[PDB]
């Protein structure tokens, strides 16, 4: 535990990226969180939504 | 005035099958729609058929092929005949009559037959 | 919160609720909360799990 | 840079201008080789229908579903899809499709819809919050109407709570009334749960029987079994394609993996959820994706 | 035709510890190199799981309930186990779900089977007793796949029930102990998902008598209950779950 | 006036802690602040949202 400084500032980059990646997952209520499947499945009035 | 007679019951072999009547008078049969019910000594009721003017029988899921509800028109009668009689249909049966217009309210009823099944 | 040393040293943990009175919930009551599975000690010590309030937690069985 | 900068003199220095990405090349659409037709006639050209009480819930899998010949026919008055839509019903995978056909009358099939209520919502038939699928409705007056009255048809008129939702109540029970208990006749007479529709052909539009069949989906969390009529593409590797496997969509390469798949496993999800890997249908094989190039000019 | 067994000896079923037992693979996606949390059906660790045997006299075949789902352990030698009976009320009223694995095939039938109170298979010293039902009228769903199957053998299943669809796990595992369940991990795979859509409130398990009255031979079988909870699944390089940790065991595990 | 500039880290941190609270009581266009009311009031399509 000598070099945590630099250990906590790499962690933290590391964790914010980890943490930006997995909000990729949440649908933020729309009915997927995949863009793909919502081109696909619906028209544009409500795809738009 | 409205009455609703019912015939058939007594006390029969296990097997042997039986012709319940539901006789109605003082209203015009048509429009009416009329059920069969029946209740064990110490159980509650049990609801047996419909039966419309169509002639569209809907028979409850519980018990399947024992009975066969008919009805007649000529004469405003109610017919059921009941085939391969267990031991469990000692009962007393009801004949009920609800309108077609308005919220299932099965009105008068029957006095009740009694079915006596032994061997 | 969960008070642990390293997984490599031990599994015994303590668990502190914090603003809970002890008997709203090994049982000791601090100011920062209830703190559940730690022995309290009146040895003064350097701190290794702070606490708060002045308590602090280490192993040696967890002490507070 | 001129144009990024907002100035027609740039000074000396390194500017991050645009995003490069290399597009696609072509499309490769890869579906099960399997060419069975649905049995859609089996459902929508039955000669019978069950009442809405006891609704009629069909399994259809393991065949090719060719949805265009629904939409474009012209008998269905009613067709309103929820969470899909009627054009791109062709070109999805769909596993788990249940077809559920009853009969109601004309007004009541606004009832047919997630968050409706009524007497078929909440005691005869009761969709999800989340449903995904098609209810299509059509009048059947010169089919299930008889000039006497047709009585083959009922409704559940009371139930003690609401249904849940894709729940079947063939359950005929007596029900009491309120302060006499059912013991007999000796109380207030005794209410019947199932009404019959008084269908006659001389009744008004809202009145007549309507048919309804509603198709319900779940969106590819299995191996998928009813997919739609487009024509199987061959593979290609090592370049960047905007594939569609199954009803999944994307672009990337797809390259020889060294993944060892168990047999049930089908695909492979990276933290972000997006699809890394994927069992192509036909050749069962193992195909890694990879994102295309992309970076910063 | 069903014949009442009246030889056997009244002992109450036992308990014991389920250990880290009754993982599954949660779903068909590969993951690898990764923690991966999961909220599903899973049964907890360290769990009161009960014990029933098969010894000559005991011939534990009990009513059970099914919950929301059910963890099958089984320290079989020899093949007296041979399938599994689902349903409500397991008569002609209610559709009930056979599950067999005979001498030749495993067979799955949905029908109103008219069950016998003590469904058996019998091997005499072949095969040639089955009373396992007196009727069946209506059935809606056929299945027949591949056989699935000191005590030598291990067996986990898990029978889930969601949607319609009844999803059986399994894992087949050589061990060496004699009494009770090793203490270790082994994930379940998936074996296979049934389109049944039927209603499941109770199950049986189908044994084997041995004849030469009857006689049971050598087996134990374990029952363990399904609960909605999280783990948190560690999966290698090679996308096999090693490591399983239950979120809601003790605050360590949290 | 001495020690002001303690108070004013006093003061903005419970202003602060006011300020959050307060917050609660405005429905940001919905027709109440209290999700109770609007889960006894109406129905959950509507409720959702
Ligand atoms: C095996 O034992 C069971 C339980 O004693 C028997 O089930 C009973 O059989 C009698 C005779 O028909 C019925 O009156 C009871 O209602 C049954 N009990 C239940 C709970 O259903 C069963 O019949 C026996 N097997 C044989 C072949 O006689
Ligand atoms: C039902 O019959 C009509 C009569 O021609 C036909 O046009 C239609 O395609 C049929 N529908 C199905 C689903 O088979
Ligand atoms: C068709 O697909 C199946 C998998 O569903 C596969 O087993 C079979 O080999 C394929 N047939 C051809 C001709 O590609
Ligand atoms: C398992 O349950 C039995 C009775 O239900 C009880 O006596 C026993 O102590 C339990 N075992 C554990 C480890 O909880
Ligand atoms: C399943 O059966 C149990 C008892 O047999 C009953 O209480 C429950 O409501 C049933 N569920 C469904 C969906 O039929
Ligand atoms: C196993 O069960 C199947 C299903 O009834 C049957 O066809 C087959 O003959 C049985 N085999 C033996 C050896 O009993
Ligand atoms: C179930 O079987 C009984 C007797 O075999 C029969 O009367 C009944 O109609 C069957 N149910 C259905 C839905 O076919
Ligand atoms: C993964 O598989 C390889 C064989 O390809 C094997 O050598 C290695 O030990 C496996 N990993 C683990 C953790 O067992």
């Known amino acids: 535990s000598a070099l945590g400084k630099l250990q906590d500032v790499v962690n933290q980059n590391a964790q914010a990226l980890n943490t930006l990646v997995k909000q990729l997952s949440s649908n933020f209520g729309a009915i997927s969180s995949v863009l793909n499947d919502i081109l696909s499945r619906l028209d544009p009035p409500e795809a738009e939504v | 005035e409205v009455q609703l007679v019912e015939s058939g019951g007594g006390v029969v072999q296990p097997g042997r099958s039986l012709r319940l009547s539901c006789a109605a008078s003082?209203?015009?049969?048509?429009?009416?729609?009329m059920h069969w019910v029946r209740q064990a000594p110490g159980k509650g009721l049990e609801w047996i058929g419909n039966?419309?003017?169509?002639?569209?029988?809907f028979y409850n899921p519980s018990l399947k092929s024992l009975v066969t509800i008919s009805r007649d028109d000529s004469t405003n009668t109610l017919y059921l005949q009941m085939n391969s009689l267990r031991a469990e249909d000692t009962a007393i049966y009801y004949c009920?009559?609800?309108?077609?217009?308005?919220?299932?309210?099965?009105?008068?009823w029957g006095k009740g037959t009694l079915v006596t099944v032994s061997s | 919160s969960v008070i642990t040393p390293g997984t490599n040293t031990s599994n015994q943990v303590a668990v502190l609720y914090q603003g809970v009175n002890c008997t709203e919930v090994n049982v000791f009551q601090t100011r920062a909360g209830c703190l559940i599975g730690a022995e309290h000690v009146n040895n003064s010590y350097e701190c290794d799990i702070p606490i708060g309030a002045g308590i602090c937690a280490s192993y040696q069985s967890i002490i507070a | 840079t001129k144009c990024t900068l907002k100035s027609f003199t740039v000074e000396k220095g390194i500017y991050q201008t645009s995003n490069f990405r290399v597009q696609p090349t072509e499309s490769i659409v890869r579906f099960p080789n399997i060419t069975n037709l649905c049995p859609f006639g089996e459902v929508f050209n039955a000669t019978r229908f069950a009442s809405v009480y006891a609704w009629n819930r069909k399994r259809i899998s393991n065949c090719v579903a060719d949805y265009s010949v629904l939409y474009n026919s012209a008998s269905f008055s009613t067709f309103k899809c929820y969470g899909v839509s009627p054009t791109k019903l062709n070109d999805l995978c769909f596993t788990n499709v249940y077809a559920d056909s009853f009969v109601i009358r004309g007004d009541e099939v606004r009832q047919i819809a997630p968050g409706q209520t009524g007497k078929i919502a909440d005691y005869n038939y009761k969709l999800p919050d989340d449903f995904t699928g098609c209810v299509i409705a059509w009048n059947s007056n010169n089919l299930d109407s008889k000039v006497g009255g047709n009585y083959n048809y009922l409704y559940r008129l009371f139930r003690k709570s609401n249904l849940k939702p894709f729940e079947r109540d063939i359950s005929t029970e007596i029900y009491q009334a309120g302060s006499t208990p059912c013991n007999g006749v000796e109380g207030f007479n005794c209410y019947f749960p199932l009404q019959s529709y008084g269908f006659q052909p001389t009744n008004g539009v809202g009145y007549q029987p309507y048919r309804v069949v509603v198709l319900s989906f779940e969106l590819l969390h299995a191996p998928a079994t009813v997919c739609g009529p487009k024509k199987s593409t061959n593979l290609v590797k090592n370049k960047c394609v905007n594939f569609n496997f199954n009803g999944l969509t994307g672009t990337g390469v797809l390259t020889e993996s060294n993944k060892k798949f168990l047999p049930f496993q089908q695909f492979g999800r990276d933290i972000a959820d997006t699809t890394d890997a994927v069992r192509d249908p036909q050749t069962l094989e193992i195909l890694d994706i990879t994102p295309c190039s992309f970076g910063g000019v | 035709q069903c014949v009442n067994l009246t030889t056997r000896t009244q002992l109450p079923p036992a308990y014991t510890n389920s250990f880290t037992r009754g993982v599954y693979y949660p779903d068909k996606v590969f993951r690898s190199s990764v923690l991966h949390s999961t909220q599903d059906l899973f049964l907890p660790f360290f769990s009161n799981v009960t014990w029933f045997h098969a010894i000559h006299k005991r011939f534990d075949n009990p009513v059970l309930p099914f919950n929301d789902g059910v963890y099958f352990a089984s320290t079989e030698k020899s093949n007296i186990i041979r399938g599994w009976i689902f349903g409500t009320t397991l008569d002609s009223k209610t559709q009930s779900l056979l599950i067999v694995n005979n001498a030749t095939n495993v067979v799955i039938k949905v029908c109103e089977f008219q069950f016998c109170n003590d469904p058996f298979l019998g091997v005499y010293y072949m095969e040639s007793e089955f009373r396992v039902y007196s009727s069946a009228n209506n059935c809606t769903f056929e299945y027949v796949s591949q056989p699935f199957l000191n005590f030598k053998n291990l067996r986990e299943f898990v029978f889930k029930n969601i949607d319609g669809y009844f999803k059986i796990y399994s894992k087949h595992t050589p061990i060496n102990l004699v009494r009770d369940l090793p203490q270790g991990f082994s994930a379940l795979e998936p074996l296979v998902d049934l389109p049944i859509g039927i209603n499941i409130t109770r199950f049986q398990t189908l044994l084997a008598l041995h004849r030469s009255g009857w006689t049971a031979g050598a087996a134990a079988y374990y029952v363990g209950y399904l609960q909605p909870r999280t783990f948190l699944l560690k999966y290698n390089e090679n996308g096999t779950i090693t490591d399983a940790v239950d979120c809601a065991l003790d605050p360590l595990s949290e | 006036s001495a020690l002001g500039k303690l108070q004013d880290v006093v003061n903005q941190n419970a202003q602060a802690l006011n300020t959050l609270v307060k917050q609660l009581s405005s429905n940001f266009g919905a027709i109440s602040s209290v999700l109770n009311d609007i889960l006894s009031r109406l129905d959950p399509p509507e409720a959702e949202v």
């Open positions: 009920a009559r609800v309108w077609l217009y308005g919220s299932g309210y099965m009105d008068v």
């Open positions: 003082g209203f015009t049969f048509s429009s009416y729609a």
């Open positions: 039966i419309y003017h169509d002639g569209s029988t």
